[PDB]
Amino acid sequence: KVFERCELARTLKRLGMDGYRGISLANWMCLAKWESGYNTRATNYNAGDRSTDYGIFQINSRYWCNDGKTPGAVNACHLSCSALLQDNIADAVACLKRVVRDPQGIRAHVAWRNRCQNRDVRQYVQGCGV
């Protein structure tokens, strides 16, 4: 499913993401956008390390989830990658909360670093009532 802007702003915030580890809702919304276009079914296969990025946040199968088909898997989220492909993002959000608790925080997502970090991201939450 593809979330509309404010729809995602409200569910992410309902899941207590607004200010999680200092990361604002707007900044979470900017990650989602540049990562998958707000699409939960988004998946990106990297023939390189043979890993795959899953769901709305494009979490990689090599360190966070297990899809049973990528070398050197750690599965730090103790979750199946297939859970990151559901209409309900509770599972993906909880795993993301885990990703950012790591030293690098949100700077883990290079898409967010390129398109979000240090920039104005208040349009992502504009008029959403959040």
Find the CATH number of the domain harbouring 89: 1.10.530.10
Domain count, the chain: 1
Residue 49 catalytic? no
Which of 18, 53, 67, 91 is flagged as catalytic? 53
Separation in Å, CA 62 to CA 4, 7, 27, 76, 77: 29, 30, 24, 9, 11
Which of 4, 18, 35, 102 is flagged as catalytic? 35
Separation in Å, CA 94 to CA 16, 98, 112: 10, 7, 18
Residue 87 catalytic? no
Domain boundaries, position 118: 1-130
Experimental method of this PDB entry: X-ray
> What SS3 class is residue 62?
coil
